[PDB]
Every structure is written in C-alpha cells, then in structure tokens.
C-alpha cells in the first residue's frame, strides 16, 4: 500500500523497478518521495 502511494507520487525510474501497473487529500512524504521509494522498494 505504502509502496503504491510512493510510486504514484515518485518518478518511476528506480533501477530495480526497471514492473509497473496503472489503474485509475494527498499524502505528505516527510523527505522527498524519491528517497522513501528507494529505501522501501528493496
């Protein structure tokens, strides 16, 4: 769930990420969403 939210906000360019799927109040990400995505995807 958190990974989905981070993926939506963050640019999808993580080396490990490159699969991706697309389906149809915001979430605040305390650091930049890119760092959270990088630290969470592993």
């Amino acid at each position: 769930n958190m990974l989905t939210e981070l993926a939506g906000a963050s640019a999808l360019d993580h080396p490990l990420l490159v699969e991706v799927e697309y389906v149809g109040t915001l979430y605040s990400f305390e650091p930049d969403p890119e760092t959270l995505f990088d630290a969470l995807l592993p």
């Binding site: 989905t4 993926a7 939506g8 999808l12 991706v20 799927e21 697309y22 149809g24």
Partner: peptide, 8 residues
C-alpha cells in the same frame, strides 16, 4: 508495482 494513476 501497482500505481493508482492512468496509463501514459
């Protein structure tokens, strides 16, 4: 990795 956004 599910993404809740429309396809590009």
């Amino acid at each position: 990795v599910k993404v809740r956004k429309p396809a590009p």
